[PDB]
């Protein structure tokens, strides 16, 4: 209730086009739709542990310290943001949305306790047992920035306060490196030359930048772009592409094997899926021209790739283009569209990834991407300012 920036907002960004064959009208109700389903498959609230709190259900994986792993720090962050968004549309939204913050806050990590622990596990034993991974706290830390313009910080949770303490508390203090770059989580090295592409996300740095007037944000914003382009000039010279890990300085593609992560982290695989997003989005928001350039090399690159045809994209690809997936999902098709709207003569792309996306049910991860991406093309991912 009270929502400021109730859905839909359906902003048009300078520059950035949008699906056309379908009203505005037919994009948001895609949109509610999917995040119905999505909220009535993934968004859980039964840990016997922390009644009242939320958390995103993830893949079904191994167990982690004796731990079995019902959710993570990434999707955290996801459904923070997705839930902040829909807000006006489900009435339910702060109230979720503030049993999501508890979790991520209860769920504290052993290392930097102002960040959040990266597996969420039904056990007390499991809050403030694990480390951190940057992207989810860039996530939630975000989404805090969301809420408050949202809702307001006035109420029970000061979004605002609590958004500028894990930014400068957290994430400066133990993500943000010397070299002006951003490690994996706050059990990597201050120092650290490790990075994963799918961490910069370009505009919720600006919006750090903005809600905090620390300028350690912009400086990383133009470190990370700079590495980017290093990386790709000499490593993707034809696909504009990047590898899910970038180590060293020069940037080179992380080796195989990297972390025993997959034995495709020195290509574009699942990790690196995400980046397109996430640096497109920059443009959009904050007329970035680097991220239009970026942008465009990728988004011309796969629509050759696959002669116009979304469905044809697979999962993964090595550096050069190559075929390292056999199948479209969600997670390499949706960003690869958002990457496209900065250029107008993209619009049949736009339209027929459109209608790829829409109604594309998989699994957790390519699900959860794909709404974070379908809120953004469609404009409804507004624009958090002081």
């Given at each position: 209730?009270?929502?400021?920036?109730?859905?839909?907002?359906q902003?048009?960004?300078?520059?950035?086009?949008?699906?056309?064959?379908?009203?505005?009208?037919?994009?948001?109700?895609?949109?509610?739709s999917?995040?119905?389903?999505?909220?009535?498959?993934?968004?859980?609230?039964?840990?016997?542990?922390?009644?009242?709190?939320?958390?995103?259900?993830?893949?079904?994986?191994?167990?982690?310290?004796?731990?079995?792993?019902?959710?993570?720090?990434?999707?955290?962050?996801?459904?923070?943001?997705?839930?902040?968004?829909?807000?006006?549309?489900?009435?339910?939204?702060?109230?979720?949305?503030?049993?999501?913050?508890?979790?991520?806050?209860?769920?504290?990590?052993?290392?930097?306790?102002?960040?959040?622990?990266?597996?969420?596990?039904?056990?007390?034993?499991?809050?403030?047992?694990?480390?951190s991974?940057?992207?989810?706290?860039?996530?939630?830390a975000?989404?805090?920035?969301?809420?408050?313009?949202?809702?307001?910080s006035?109420?029970?949770?000061?979004?605002?306060?609590?958004?500028?303490?894990?930014?400068?508390?957290?994430?400066?203090?133990?993500?943000?490196?010397?070299?002006?770059?951003?490690?994996?989580?706050?059990?990597?090295?201050?120092?650290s030359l490790?990075?994963?592409?799918?961490?910069?996300?370009?505009?919720?740095?600006?919006?750090?930048?903005?809600?905090?007037?620390?300028?350690?944000?912009?400086?990383?914003?133009?470190?990370?772009?700079?590495?980017?382009?290093?990386?790709?000039?000499?490593?993707?010279?034809?696909?504009?592409?990047?590898?899910?890990?970038?180590?060293?300085?020069?940037?080179?593609?992380?080796?195989?094997?990297?972390?025993?992560?997959?034995?495709?982290?020195?290509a574009?695989?699942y990790?690196?899926?995400?980046?397109?997003?996430?640096?497109?989005m920059?443009?959009?928001?904050?007329?970035?021209?680097?991220?239009?350039?970026?942008?465009?090399?990728?988004?011309?690159?796969?629509?050759?790739?696959?002669?116009?045809?979304?469905?044809?994209?697979?999962?993964?690809?090595?550096?050069?283009?190559?075929n390292?997936?056999?199948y479209?999902?969600?997670?390499?098709?949706?960003?690869?569209?958002?990457?496209?709207?900065?250029?107008?003569?993209?619009?049949?792309?736009?339209?027929?990834?459109?209608?790829?996306?829409?109604?594309?049910?998989?699994?957790?991860?390519?699900?959860?991407?794909?709404?974070?991406?379908?809120?953004?093309?469609?404009?409804?991912?507004?624009?958090?300012?002081?």
């Amino acid at each position: 209730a009270k929502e400021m920036k109730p859905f839909p907002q359906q902003v048009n960004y300078a520059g950035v086009i949008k699906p056309n064959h379908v009203t505005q009208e037919s994009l948001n109700a895609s949109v509610r739709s999917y995040y119905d389903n999505w909220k009535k498959k993934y968004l859980k609230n039964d840990l016997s542990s922390l009644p009242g709190g939320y958390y995103v259900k993830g893949e079904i994986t191994g167990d982690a310290d004796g731990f079995k792993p019902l959710g993570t720090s990434e999707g955290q962050g996801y459904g923070m943001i997705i839930t902040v968004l829909m807000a006006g549309y489900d009435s339910n939204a702060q109230k979720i949305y503030d049993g999501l913050f508890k979790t991520a806050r209860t769920f504290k990590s052993s290392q930097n306790p102002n960040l959040m622990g990266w597996v969420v596990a039904d056990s007390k034993k499991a809050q403030g047992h694990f480390d951190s991974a940057t992207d989810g706290d860039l996530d939630i830390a975000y989404s805090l920035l969301l809420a408050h313009k949202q809702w307001g910080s006035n109420g029970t949770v000061n979004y605002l306060k609590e958004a500028q303490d894990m930014i400068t508390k957290g994430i400066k203090a133990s993500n943000v490196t010397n070299n002006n770059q951003l490690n994996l989580g706050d059990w990597d090295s201050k120092s650290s030359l490790d990075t994963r592409p799918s961490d910069w996300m370009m505009s919720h740095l600006r919006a750090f930048y903005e809600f905090t007037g620390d300028k350690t944000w912009l400086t990383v914003i133009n470190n990370l772009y700079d590495v980017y382009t290093q990386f790709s000039n000499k490593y993707s010279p034809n696909t504009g592409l990047i590898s899910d890990f970038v180590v060293k300085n020069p940037p080179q593609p992380a080796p195989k094997d990297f972390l025993d992560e997959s034995e495709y982290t020195n290509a574009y695989y699942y990790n690196a899926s995400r980046v397109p997003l996430r640096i497109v989005m920059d443009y959009a928001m904050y007329g970035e021209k680097r991220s239009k350039v970026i942008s465009d090399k990728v988004s011309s690159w796969i629509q050759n790739k696959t002669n116009g045809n979304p469905s044809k994209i697979v999962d993964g690809y090595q550096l050069n283009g190559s075929n390292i997936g056999s199948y479209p999902t969600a997670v390499f098709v949706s960003p690869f569209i958002a990457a496209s709207i900065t250029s107008s003569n993209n619009q049949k792309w736009v339209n027929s990834g459109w209608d790829w996306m829409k109604n594309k049910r998989e699994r957790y991860f390519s699900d959860s991407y794909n709404l974070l991406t379908m809120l953004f093309i469609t404009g409804n991912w507004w624009k958090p300012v002081p």
